[PDB]
């Protein structure tokens, strides 16, 4: 039902807000949410890379 | 063959040295722009042209060889087509309301804070950008994305530079 | 649902684009997607190795 | 407290909106340079002046308030004095043989490969730099050193930036 | 058929009982004249020194029996592939034909690598003759084997110092 | 500038496509070498010339533009001078006893085990290297040192490559 | 010192060549040698900092 | 006192033997001994770098 992930990611995607994605190993990826499904986020910076949600700790908006 | 005609234009433009200088670029761009009276411009000036040569000069000869000129020229033709299509009010200029669509069509997905910074630094008091400013903005934006990509090897969205790389990427431009 | 992973990995596989696969411990594997299912990616470099998706953080290509 | 006279000059130069635009800076620089026939120049153009305002515009108003203008003005008067002193052949231009001395006097201790890149980007086919190009080069060089200093908090000689910080620091003119 | 191979080897190798670059060149130029299907300006000495160098894993400067057998068996297999993937019967391998031929040889390469091979081994029409094709595959095979042996943890990445680098790039 | 001689030579060599192919390079090298019968040589062959073009072809056009040709031509002139000077027995060839001194003069300070590997691959059964073999060896050795230096950024004497960088740096020609 | 250190550091200083200074903990400092004595190197990047020679592993130029 | 290290380094230098130099933090440098004095070793690979002896654990040749 009241999934909070989809609205949150869609708002980042539509307004092209830069995000930091911290992985469970503490590494920081930065770019824009191009796309996402139940299991992955397509993150676009200079390449388009696939990030598994199971490897993410946090999505932090820049603004 | 259409690539053969393009090499003929390059060789004519480049003259005695086999390279296109800032002044040869300025002269050919001011000639092309006058045959398109739909493109409002106060002209390409020498300093804008030195900058366009500088960011395209990947082998540091100080001038554009064939491959550097082809990349620049094909970008300018593509961005000329975008300028006309996204000039929805037919002002001959790109307004603040038009610039996001034009840059998106050029393949730059930027946030409003960056569009505001661009309009502040490239547009006039009415927030309108003329054709030389638009081409100059895109040549630099394209080069700065390419410079960032080449330094972002692990694809993390962040790069590390010392002062010499910083001066090369900020002054050479 | 799982609707973004297959298209993304199949495009890497078909065009034989080299990918970097970062594991959750930060280690980098490089080669080609030979194939994949719900749980694993067969990565080909000089051997053909099985990589568990649960141990992957990111799959970054070279476009 | 003879800085009240300087503040009065600023308020006169700024007019109504109490900030100095790119156009107001261009007009006052072109006025000053005509009083010095010692300074060879094709004039300060709008693009060079928008660039100088942009790198000096610390509060992002798009124009120069008092402290931004004072810093820029004091730098321009000091660099004017250096230009004349290091113009040893009295050409009204700074030649590649003269540039290292002038930049050293301005407090920039750079290596030959950086001097060579500056001459390639700011000087003409004879390796001579006119006054507007020399001032524009130093305004940018000074700003790029200050931007690097402010991001190098641990003083390691290396800066880490994402694409938004990169575009903010590089998208100039 | 191992019997036939040892007879050929002894005859080809002569006194020093190893195959030099010159002996390899002479036997390859002899074989290729019996196949007017194979367009070639001939195997030259520099291509043959290169083939001996990448196959000379015991560093004698020439090919002993096992080095020659490995090379010879590769050449026979690749000759068969060359003819089969020459679809327009030009006697040469065109840019459109090269991917299929290399795939059949067991090299699954991306188009950017095919483009650089055609740039370096093919003529101004993008056609590769027989000596160029054999020379390309002997090197490609050797460079894959060298990479495999240095990628012990299977990460797709190897580390070399300047001596290993010069051994792998110059002795070729 | 008196680099007009170079430009004249390049334009005459390059013909219609205004770039120097492997075939055009082979033809000019075979002409130059016949003027010097004290350079023993069986001739520059097409495969050696494709290899020299490949390592010098920085912009991947498959042929040598002006700047790529100048770099190669300047190296060949310097190495021709070294060949004659280090040919102490006047054989017209560089012997195993001569090769260390010649390579040291070219700027390559290598250990005996590497000199032996070079002799094994580029010299004849008497350990003598003829002129085309010497130039071909130096063009490759120079390129392989430059490739290694550009990947060894931390200067640790060790490089890391994937299979595509490896195939790019090793497949020649 | 009395053979190789002074000439080496003076050549860096005079030609204003950028150096990396690696510390014994593996941290990399980049700038130009402003000056040096028996015990320290003054390194200039944007500030002028004092680096103890006892904490340095390597001084590496770019030429 | 340095009656064993000078002959050892000089033999490496003269015969141009590749050495691995391990630093006290475990990092490995490879090149040729260009030169050395009481306090430093000039190591040459593609650059010429100054290595402080106080930061060295071992010099491992391929002799
Ligand atoms: N893109 C990317 N993903 C990672 N996952 C873990 N480390 C990295 C890294 O360096 N880059
Ligand atoms: N193939 C491979 N998988 C790993 N997983 C963690 N480390 C490694 C490694 O070195 N190689
Ligand atoms: N040259 C060099 N010295 C070091 N000291 C510690 N780490 C390094 C490194 O990566 N390179
Ligand atoms: N010989 C040697 N010395 C070291 N010092 C630190 N690590 C090493 C190592 O692996 N080998
Ligand atoms: Ca020109
Ligand atoms: Ca150029
Ligand atoms: Ca409009
Ligand atoms: Ca304009
Ligand atoms: Ca990165
Ligand atoms: Ca005003
Ligand atoms: Ca302001
Ligand atoms: Ca002068
Ligand atoms: Ca000017
Ligand atoms: Ca820092
Ligand atoms: Ca024999
Ligand atoms: Ca052997
Ligand atoms: Ca064919
Ligand atoms: Ca051939
Ligand atoms: Ca590995
Ligand atoms: Ca030609
Ligand atoms: Ca080229
Ligand atoms: Ca001799
Ligand atoms: Ca020869
Ligand atoms: Ca390294």
CSV table of N, CA, C and O in Angstrom, one decimal, chain B residues 21 23 42 46-48 50-51 54 57 60-62 110-111 113-114 117-118 120-125 132-133 136-138 140-141 144-145 147-148 151 157-164 166-173, chain D residues 42-43 46-48 50-51 54 57 60-63 110-111 113-114 117-118 120-125 132-133 137-138 140-141 143-145 147-148 151 157-173:
chain,number,residue,atom,x,y,z
B,21,UNK,N,42.6,28.5,-36.9
B,21,UNK,CA,42.8,29.4,-35.8
B,21,UNK,C,41.5,30.0,-35.3
B,21,UNK,O,40.4,29.8,-35.9
B,23,UNK,N,40.8,33.2,-35.4
B,23,UNK,CA,40.3,34.3,-36.3
B,23,UNK,C,39.7,33.6,-37.5
B,23,UNK,O,38.6,34.1,-38.0
B,42,UNK,N,25.1,39.7,-31.9
B,42,UNK,CA,26.0,40.9,-32.0
B,42,UNK,C,27.3,40.4,-32.6
B,42,UNK,O,28.3,41.1,-32.6
B,46,UNK,N,36.5,37.7,-31.1
B,46,UNK,CA,37.7,36.9,-31.1
B,46,UNK,C,37.9,36.2,-29.7
B,46,UNK,O,38.3,35.0,-29.7
B,47,UNK,N,37.5,36.8,-28.6
B,47,UNK,CA,37.7,36.1,-27.3
B,47,UNK,C,36.8,34.9,-27.2
B,47,UNK,O,37.3,33.9,-26.7
B,48,UNK,N,35.6,35.0,-27.6
B,48,UNK,CA,34.7,33.8,-27.6
B,48,UNK,C,35.2,32.7,-28.5
B,48,UNK,O,35.3,31.5,-28.1
B,50,UNK,N,38.6,32.3,-29.4
B,50,UNK,CA,39.8,31.7,-28.7
B,50,UNK,C,39.4,30.7,-27.7
B,50,UNK,O,40.0,29.6,-27.6
B,51,UNK,N,38.3,31.0,-26.9
B,51,UNK,CA,37.8,30.0,-25.9
B,51,UNK,C,37.3,28.8,-26.6
B,51,UNK,O,37.5,27.7,-26.1
B,54,UNK,N,40.3,26.8,-27.7
B,54,UNK,CA,41.0,26.3,-26.4
B,54,UNK,C,40.3,25.1,-25.9
B,54,UNK,O,41.0,24.1,-25.7
B,57,UNK,N,40.8,22.1,-28.2
B,57,UNK,CA,42.2,21.8,-28.7
B,57,UNK,C,42.9,20.7,-27.8
B,57,UNK,O,43.8,21.0,-27.0
B,60,UNK,N,46.7,20.3,-27.8
B,60,UNK,CA,47.4,21.6,-27.4
B,60,UNK,C,48.3,22.2,-28.5
B,60,UNK,O,49.3,22.7,-28.2
B,61,UNK,N,47.9,22.1,-29.8
B,61,UNK,CA,48.6,22.8,-30.9
B,61,UNK,C,48.2,24.3,-31.0
B,61,UNK,O,48.8,25.0,-31.8
B,62,UNK,N,47.2,24.7,-30.2
B,62,UNK,CA,46.6,26.1,-30.2
B,62,UNK,C,45.6,26.3,-31.3
B,62,UNK,O,45.0,27.4,-31.4
B,110,UNK,N,20.0,19.2,-16.7
B,110,UNK,CA,20.5,20.1,-15.5
B,110,UNK,C,19.3,20.5,-14.7
B,110,UNK,O,18.2,20.5,-15.1
B,111,UNK,N,19.6,20.8,-13.4
B,111,UNK,CA,18.5,21.3,-12.4
B,111,UNK,C,18.4,22.8,-12.6
B,111,UNK,O,19.3,23.5,-13.1
B,113,UNK,N,18.7,25.3,-10.5
B,113,UNK,CA,19.8,26.1,-9.9
B,113,UNK,C,20.9,26.4,-11.0
B,113,UNK,O,21.4,27.5,-11.1
B,114,UNK,N,21.3,25.3,-11.7
B,114,UNK,CA,22.3,25.4,-12.8
B,114,UNK,C,21.8,26.3,-14.0
B,114,UNK,O,22.5,27.1,-14.5
B,117,UNK,N,22.1,29.9,-13.1
B,117,UNK,CA,23.5,30.3,-13.1
B,117,UNK,C,23.9,30.6,-14.6
B,117,UNK,O,24.4,31.7,-14.8
B,118,UNK,N,23.5,29.7,-15.5
B,118,UNK,CA,23.8,29.9,-16.9
B,118,UNK,C,23.1,31.2,-17.4
B,118,UNK,O,23.9,32.0,-18.1
B,120,UNK,N,22.2,33.8,-15.7
B,120,UNK,CA,22.9,35.0,-15.1
B,120,UNK,C,24.1,35.3,-15.9
B,120,UNK,O,24.3,36.5,-16.2
B,121,UNK,N,24.9,34.3,-16.3
B,121,UNK,CA,26.3,34.6,-16.9
B,121,UNK,C,26.3,34.6,-18.4
B,121,UNK,O,27.3,35.1,-18.9
B,122,UNK,N,25.2,34.2,-19.1
B,122,UNK,CA,25.3,34.2,-20.6
B,122,UNK,C,24.2,35.0,-21.2
B,122,UNK,O,24.3,35.2,-22.4
B,123,UNK,N,23.1,35.4,-20.5
B,123,UNK,CA,21.9,36.0,-21.0
B,123,UNK,C,22.0,37.5,-20.6
B,123,UNK,O,22.8,37.8,-19.7
B,124,UNK,N,21.1,38.3,-21.2
B,124,UNK,CA,21.0,39.8,-21.0
B,124,UNK,C,20.0,40.1,-19.8
B,124,UNK,O,19.4,39.1,-19.3
B,125,UNK,N,19.7,41.3,-19.6
B,125,UNK,CA,18.8,41.8,-18.4
B,125,UNK,C,17.4,41.2,-18.6
B,125,UNK,O,16.7,41.0,-17.5
B,132,UNK,N,25.4,33.5,-30.7
B,132,UNK,CA,26.9,33.4,-30.3
B,132,UNK,C,27.0,33.0,-28.9
B,132,UNK,O,27.8,32.1,-28.5
B,133,UNK,N,26.2,33.6,-28.0
B,133,UNK,CA,26.3,33.3,-26.5
B,133,UNK,C,25.8,31.8,-26.3
B,133,UNK,O,26.4,31.1,-25.5
B,136,UNK,N,28.4,29.4,-27.6
B,136,UNK,CA,29.6,29.5,-26.7
B,136,UNK,C,29.4,28.7,-25.4
B,136,UNK,O,30.2,28.0,-24.9
B,137,UNK,N,28.2,28.9,-24.9
B,137,UNK,CA,27.7,28.3,-23.6
B,137,UNK,C,27.7,26.7,-23.9
B,137,UNK,O,28.4,26.0,-23.1
B,138,UNK,N,27.2,26.3,-25.0
B,138,UNK,CA,27.1,24.8,-25.2
B,138,UNK,C,28.5,24.2,-25.5
B,138,UNK,O,28.7,23.1,-25.0
B,140,UNK,N,31.3,25.1,-24.2
B,140,UNK,CA,32.0,25.0,-22.9
B,140,UNK,C,31.3,23.9,-22.0
B,140,UNK,O,32.1,23.1,-21.5
B,141,UNK,N,30.0,23.9,-22.0
B,141,UNK,CA,29.2,22.9,-21.2
B,141,UNK,C,29.6,21.5,-21.7
B,141,UNK,O,29.9,20.6,-20.8
B,144,UNK,N,33.1,20.8,-20.5
B,144,UNK,CA,33.2,20.6,-19.1
B,144,UNK,C,32.6,19.2,-18.7
B,144,UNK,O,33.2,18.6,-17.8
B,145,UNK,N,31.6,18.8,-19.3
B,145,UNK,CA,31.0,17.4,-19.1
B,145,UNK,C,32.0,16.4,-19.5
B,145,UNK,O,32.3,15.4,-18.8
B,147,UNK,N,35.4,16.7,-19.8
B,147,UNK,CA,36.5,16.8,-18.9
B,147,UNK,C,36.2,16.0,-17.5
B,147,UNK,O,37.0,15.2,-17.1
B,148,UNK,N,34.9,16.2,-17.0
B,148,UNK,CA,34.5,15.6,-15.8
B,148,UNK,C,34.4,14.1,-16.0
B,148,UNK,O,35.0,13.3,-15.2
B,151,UNK,N,37.8,12.4,-16.0
B,151,UNK,CA,38.4,12.3,-14.6
B,151,UNK,C,37.6,11.4,-13.6
B,151,UNK,O,38.2,11.1,-12.6
B,157,UNK,N,30.5,10.1,-9.6
B,157,UNK,CA,29.9,11.5,-9.7
B,157,UNK,C,30.8,12.5,-9.0
B,157,UNK,O,30.2,13.6,-8.8
B,158,UNK,N,32.0,12.2,-8.7
B,158,UNK,CA,32.9,13.2,-8.0
B,158,UNK,C,34.3,13.0,-8.6
B,158,UNK,O,34.6,11.9,-8.9
B,159,UNK,N,35.1,14.0,-8.7
B,159,UNK,CA,36.5,13.9,-9.3
B,159,UNK,C,37.4,14.7,-8.3
B,159,UNK,O,36.9,15.5,-7.5
B,160,UNK,N,38.7,14.4,-8.5
B,160,UNK,CA,39.8,15.0,-7.6
B,160,UNK,C,40.7,15.7,-8.6
B,160,UNK,O,41.0,15.0,-9.6
B,161,UNK,N,41.0,17.0,-8.4
B,161,UNK,CA,42.0,17.7,-9.2
B,161,UNK,C,43.1,18.4,-8.3
B,161,UNK,O,42.7,19.0,-7.3
B,162,UNK,N,44.3,18.4,-8.8
B,162,UNK,CA,45.4,19.3,-8.2
B,162,UNK,C,45.3,20.7,-8.9
B,162,UNK,O,44.4,20.8,-9.9
B,163,UNK,N,46.1,21.6,-8.5
B,163,UNK,CA,46.0,23.0,-9.0
B,163,UNK,C,46.4,23.1,-10.5
B,163,UNK,O,45.7,23.8,-11.2
B,164,UNK,N,47.4,22.3,-11.0
B,164,UNK,CA,47.8,22.3,-12.4
B,164,UNK,C,46.6,21.8,-13.3
B,164,UNK,O,46.3,22.4,-14.3
B,166,UNK,N,43.5,21.9,-12.5
B,166,UNK,CA,42.5,22.9,-12.3
B,166,UNK,C,42.7,24.1,-13.2
B,166,UNK,O,41.8,24.5,-13.9
B,167,UNK,N,43.9,24.6,-13.2
B,167,UNK,CA,44.3,25.8,-14.1
B,167,UNK,C,44.2,25.4,-15.6
B,167,UNK,O,43.5,26.2,-16.3
B,168,UNK,N,44.7,24.2,-16.0
B,168,UNK,CA,44.5,23.7,-17.4
B,168,UNK,C,43.0,23.7,-17.8
B,168,UNK,O,42.6,24.1,-18.8
B,169,UNK,N,42.1,23.3,-16.9
B,169,UNK,CA,40.6,23.1,-17.2
B,169,UNK,C,39.8,24.4,-17.1
B,169,UNK,O,38.6,24.4,-17.5
B,170,UNK,N,40.4,25.4,-16.5
B,170,UNK,CA,39.6,26.6,-16.0
B,170,UNK,C,40.1,27.8,-16.8
B,170,UNK,O,39.4,28.8,-16.9
B,171,UNK,N,41.4,27.9,-17.2
B,171,UNK,CA,42.0,29.0,-17.9
B,171,UNK,C,42.0,28.6,-19.4
B,171,UNK,O,41.5,29.5,-20.1
B,172,UNK,N,42.5,27.4,-19.8
B,172,UNK,CA,42.4,26.8,-21.1
B,172,UNK,C,40.9,26.4,-21.5
B,172,UNK,O,40.4,25.2,-21.6
B,173,UNK,N,40.2,27.5,-21.9
B,173,UNK,CA,38.8,27.8,-21.8
B,173,UNK,C,38.7,29.2,-21.3
B,173,UNK,O,38.7,30.1,-22.1
D,42,UNK,N,42.0,46.4,-28.1
D,42,UNK,CA,40.8,46.5,-29.0
D,42,UNK,C,39.6,46.8,-28.2
D,42,UNK,O,38.5,46.6,-28.7
D,43,UNK,N,39.7,47.1,-26.9
D,43,UNK,CA,38.5,47.5,-26.0
D,43,UNK,C,38.1,46.3,-25.1
D,43,UNK,O,38.4,45.2,-25.5
D,46,UNK,N,31.7,43.0,-24.0
D,46,UNK,CA,30.6,42.6,-23.0
D,46,UNK,C,31.0,41.2,-22.5
D,46,UNK,O,30.8,41.0,-21.2
D,47,UNK,N,31.4,40.3,-23.3
D,47,UNK,CA,31.6,38.9,-22.9
D,47,UNK,C,32.7,38.9,-21.8
D,47,UNK,O,32.5,38.2,-20.8
D,48,UNK,N,33.8,39.6,-22.0
D,48,UNK,CA,34.9,39.7,-21.1
D,48,UNK,C,34.4,40.3,-19.7
D,48,UNK,O,34.7,39.7,-18.7
D,50,UNK,N,31.2,40.4,-18.6
D,50,UNK,CA,30.2,39.5,-17.9
D,50,UNK,C,31.0,38.4,-17.2
D,50,UNK,O,30.7,38.1,-16.0
D,51,UNK,N,32.1,38.0,-17.8
D,51,UNK,CA,33.0,37.0,-17.2
D,51,UNK,C,33.7,37.5,-15.9
D,51,UNK,O,33.7,36.8,-14.9
D,54,UNK,N,31.0,37.8,-13.2
D,54,UNK,CA,30.6,36.4,-12.8
D,54,UNK,C,31.7,35.9,-11.8
D,54,UNK,O,31.2,35.4,-10.7
D,57,UNK,N,31.4,37.7,-8.5
D,57,UNK,CA,30.0,37.8,-7.9
D,57,UNK,C,29.7,36.8,-6.8
D,57,UNK,O,28.9,35.9,-7.0
D,60,UNK,N,26.1,36.1,-5.7
D,60,UNK,CA,25.2,35.7,-6.9
D,60,UNK,C,24.1,36.6,-7.1
D,60,UNK,O,23.0,36.1,-7.6
D,61,UNK,N,24.3,37.9,-7.0
D,61,UNK,CA,23.3,39.0,-7.4
D,61,UNK,C,23.3,39.2,-8.9
D,61,UNK,O,22.5,39.9,-9.4
D,62,UNK,N,24.4,38.7,-9.6
D,62,UNK,CA,24.6,38.9,-11.1
D,62,UNK,C,25.3,40.2,-11.4
D,62,UNK,O,25.5,40.5,-12.5
D,63,UNK,N,25.6,41.0,-10.3
D,63,UNK,CA,26.3,42.3,-10.5
D,63,UNK,C,27.2,42.6,-9.3
D,63,UNK,O,27.2,41.8,-8.3
D,110,UNK,N,54.2,30.6,-11.3
D,110,UNK,CA,53.7,29.5,-12.1
D,110,UNK,C,54.8,28.9,-12.9
D,110,UNK,O,55.9,29.5,-13.1
D,111,UNK,N,54.6,27.6,-13.3
D,111,UNK,CA,55.7,26.9,-14.1
D,111,UNK,C,55.5,27.2,-15.6
D,111,UNK,O,54.4,27.7,-16.0
D,113,UNK,N,55.0,25.5,-18.2
D,113,UNK,CA,53.9,24.8,-19.0
D,113,UNK,C,52.6,25.6,-18.8
D,113,UNK,O,51.9,25.7,-19.8
D,114,UNK,N,52.3,26.1,-17.6
D,114,UNK,CA,51.1,27.0,-17.4
D,114,UNK,C,51.3,28.3,-18.1
D,114,UNK,O,50.3,28.8,-18.7
D,117,UNK,N,50.5,27.7,-21.7
D,117,UNK,CA,49.0,27.5,-22.0
D,117,UNK,C,48.3,28.9,-21.9
D,117,UNK,O,47.5,29.2,-22.8
D,118,UNK,N,48.7,29.8,-21.0
D,118,UNK,CA,48.1,31.1,-21.0
D,118,UNK,C,48.4,31.9,-22.2
D,118,UNK,O,47.4,32.6,-22.8
D,120,UNK,N,49.0,30.7,-25.2
D,120,UNK,CA,48.2,30.0,-26.2
D,120,UNK,C,46.8,30.6,-26.2
D,120,UNK,O,46.2,30.8,-27.2
D,121,UNK,N,46.2,30.8,-25.0
D,121,UNK,CA,44.7,31.1,-24.9
D,121,UNK,C,44.5,32.6,-24.9
D,121,UNK,O,43.4,33.0,-25.2
D,122,UNK,N,45.5,33.5,-24.5
D,122,UNK,CA,45.1,34.9,-24.3
D,122,UNK,C,45.9,35.8,-25.2
D,122,UNK,O,45.6,37.0,-25.3
D,123,UNK,N,47.0,35.3,-25.9
D,123,UNK,CA,47.9,36.1,-26.7
D,123,UNK,C,47.6,35.8,-28.2
D,123,UNK,O,46.9,34.9,-28.4
D,124,UNK,N,48.1,36.7,-29.0
D,124,UNK,CA,47.9,36.8,-30.5
D,124,UNK,C,49.0,35.9,-31.2
D,124,UNK,O,49.9,35.3,-30.4
D,125,UNK,N,49.0,35.8,-32.5
D,125,UNK,CA,49.9,34.9,-33.3
D,125,UNK,C,51.4,35.3,-33.0
D,125,UNK,O,52.2,34.4,-33.2
D,132,UNK,N,43.2,44.5,-22.2
D,132,UNK,CA,42.0,43.9,-21.8
D,132,UNK,C,42.2,42.4,-21.6
D,132,UNK,O,41.7,41.8,-20.7
D,133,UNK,N,43.0,41.7,-22.5
D,133,UNK,CA,43.3,40.3,-22.4
D,133,UNK,C,44.1,40.0,-21.1
D,133,UNK,O,43.8,39.0,-20.4
D,137,UNK,N,42.7,37.8,-18.0
D,137,UNK,CA,43.5,36.6,-17.7
D,137,UNK,C,43.7,36.7,-16.2
D,137,UNK,O,43.4,35.7,-15.5
D,138,UNK,N,44.2,37.8,-15.6
D,138,UNK,CA,44.5,37.9,-14.2
D,138,UNK,C,43.3,37.8,-13.3
D,138,UNK,O,43.4,37.2,-12.2
D,140,UNK,N,40.6,36.1,-13.8
D,140,UNK,CA,40.2,34.7,-13.8
D,140,UNK,C,41.2,33.9,-13.0
D,140,UNK,O,40.8,33.1,-12.2
D,141,UNK,N,42.5,34.1,-13.3
D,141,UNK,CA,43.6,33.3,-12.6
D,141,UNK,C,43.5,33.6,-11.1
D,141,UNK,O,43.5,32.6,-10.3
D,143,UNK,N,40.7,34.5,-9.4
D,143,UNK,CA,39.5,33.8,-8.9
D,143,UNK,C,39.7,32.3,-8.8
D,143,UNK,O,39.2,31.7,-7.9
D,144,UNK,N,40.4,31.7,-9.8
D,144,UNK,CA,40.6,30.2,-9.8
D,144,UNK,C,41.5,29.8,-8.7
D,144,UNK,O,41.1,28.8,-8.1
D,145,UNK,N,42.5,30.6,-8.3
D,145,UNK,CA,43.3,30.3,-7.2
D,145,UNK,C,42.5,30.4,-5.9
D,145,UNK,O,42.5,29.5,-5.0
D,147,UNK,N,39.1,30.1,-5.6
D,147,UNK,CA,38.1,29.0,-5.6
D,147,UNK,C,38.8,27.7,-5.1
D,147,UNK,O,38.2,27.0,-4.2
D,148,UNK,N,40.0,27.4,-5.6
D,148,UNK,CA,40.7,26.2,-5.2
D,148,UNK,C,41.1,26.3,-3.7
D,148,UNK,O,40.8,25.3,-3.0
D,151,UNK,N,38.1,25.5,-1.5
D,151,UNK,CA,37.7,24.0,-1.5
D,151,UNK,C,38.8,23.1,-0.9
D,151,UNK,O,38.4,22.0,-0.6
D,157,UNK,N,46.4,20.1,-1.6
D,157,UNK,CA,46.7,20.4,-3.0
D,157,UNK,C,45.7,19.7,-3.9
D,157,UNK,O,46.0,19.7,-5.1
D,158,UNK,N,44.6,19.2,-3.4
D,158,UNK,CA,43.7,18.4,-4.3
D,158,UNK,C,42.3,18.8,-3.8
D,158,UNK,O,42.1,19.0,-2.6
D,159,UNK,N,41.3,18.9,-4.7
D,159,UNK,CA,39.9,19.3,-4.5
D,159,UNK,C,39.0,18.2,-4.9
D,159,UNK,O,39.5,17.4,-5.8
D,160,UNK,N,37.9,17.9,-4.3
D,160,UNK,CA,36.9,16.9,-4.7
D,160,UNK,C,35.6,17.6,-5.0
D,160,UNK,O,35.2,18.4,-4.2
D,161,UNK,N,35.1,17.5,-6.2
D,161,UNK,CA,33.8,18.2,-6.6
D,161,UNK,C,32.9,17.2,-7.4
D,161,UNK,O,33.4,16.4,-8.1
D,162,UNK,N,31.6,17.4,-7.1
D,162,UNK,CA,30.6,16.8,-8.0
D,162,UNK,C,30.3,17.7,-9.2
D,162,UNK,O,30.9,18.7,-9.3
D,163,UNK,N,29.4,17.3,-10.1
D,163,UNK,CA,29.1,17.9,-11.4
D,163,UNK,C,28.5,19.3,-11.2
D,163,UNK,O,28.9,20.2,-11.8
D,164,UNK,N,27.7,19.5,-10.1
D,164,UNK,CA,27.1,20.8,-9.9
D,164,UNK,C,28.2,21.8,-9.4
D,164,UNK,O,28.2,22.9,-9.9
D,165,UNK,N,29.0,21.4,-8.5
D,165,UNK,CA,30.1,22.3,-8.0
D,165,UNK,C,31.0,22.6,-9.3
D,165,UNK,O,31.5,23.7,-9.4
D,166,UNK,N,31.3,21.5,-10.0
D,166,UNK,CA,32.2,21.7,-11.2
D,166,UNK,C,31.6,22.7,-12.2
D,166,UNK,O,32.3,23.6,-12.7
D,167,UNK,N,30.3,22.6,-12.6
D,167,UNK,CA,29.6,23.5,-13.5
D,167,UNK,C,29.6,24.9,-12.9
D,167,UNK,O,29.9,25.9,-13.6
D,168,UNK,N,29.3,25.1,-11.6
D,168,UNK,CA,29.3,26.4,-10.9
D,168,UNK,C,30.7,27.0,-11.0
D,168,UNK,O,30.7,28.2,-11.2
D,169,UNK,N,31.8,26.3,-10.9
D,169,UNK,CA,33.2,26.9,-10.9
D,169,UNK,C,33.7,27.1,-12.3
D,169,UNK,O,34.7,27.8,-12.5
D,170,UNK,N,33.1,26.5,-13.3
D,170,UNK,CA,33.7,26.4,-14.7
D,170,UNK,C,32.9,27.2,-15.7
D,170,UNK,O,33.4,27.6,-16.7
D,171,UNK,N,31.6,27.3,-15.5
D,171,UNK,CA,30.7,27.9,-16.5
D,171,UNK,C,30.7,29.5,-16.4
D,171,UNK,O,29.8,30.1,-15.9
D,172,UNK,N,31.8,30.0,-17.0
D,172,UNK,CA,32.2,31.5,-16.9
D,172,UNK,C,32.3,32.1,-18.3
D,172,UNK,O,32.7,31.4,-19.3
D,173,UNK,N,31.9,33.3,-18.4
D,173,UNK,CA,31.8,34.3,-19.6
D,173,UNK,C,30.4,34.8,-19.7
D,173,UNK,O,29.8,34.7,-18.6
